[PDB]
């Protein structure tokens, strides 16, 4: 329960089976670390029976949206949750609704 280290939505290096298992309702979301891509983040949130994984950091280490930026990845999840707005990326409005829960991974 402290920064990305134990944030309420940051689960940590998750897998494709566990992350998808956390999406029980269309709207739950969570951030994890790309296992194949060391030094990258991802957002596995269900929008309506179709999990969407978006990289929180672009190929040049830069979190942003269709026309915005996030000083920190935590600022990204708190920005969309502040106005229930989507994240958008390449044709997918990943909308957030309820953060899952971990607070323990990330080290």
């Amino acid at each position: 329960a402290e920064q990305l280290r134990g944030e309420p939505w940051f689960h940590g290096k998750l897998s494709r089976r566990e992350a998808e298992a956390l999406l029980q309702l269309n709207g739950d979301f969570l951030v994890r670390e790309s296992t194949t891509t060391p030094g990258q983040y991802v957002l596995t949130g269900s929008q309506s029976g179709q999990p969407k994984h978006l990289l929180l950091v672009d190929p040049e280490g830069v979190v942003r949206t269709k026309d915005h930026r996030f000083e920190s990845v935590s600022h990204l999840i708190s920005y969309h949750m502040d106005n229930h707005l989507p994240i958008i990326s390449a044709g997918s409005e990943l909308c957030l609704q309820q953060p899952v829960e971990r607070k323990l991974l990330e080290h």
Partner: peptide, 14 residues
């Protein structure tokens, strides 16, 4: 290459 791609927020380019 390809891959699985994930994405990103954002972009776009190219």
């Amino acid at each position: 290459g390809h891959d699985g791609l994930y994405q990103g927020l954002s972009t776009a380019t190219k």
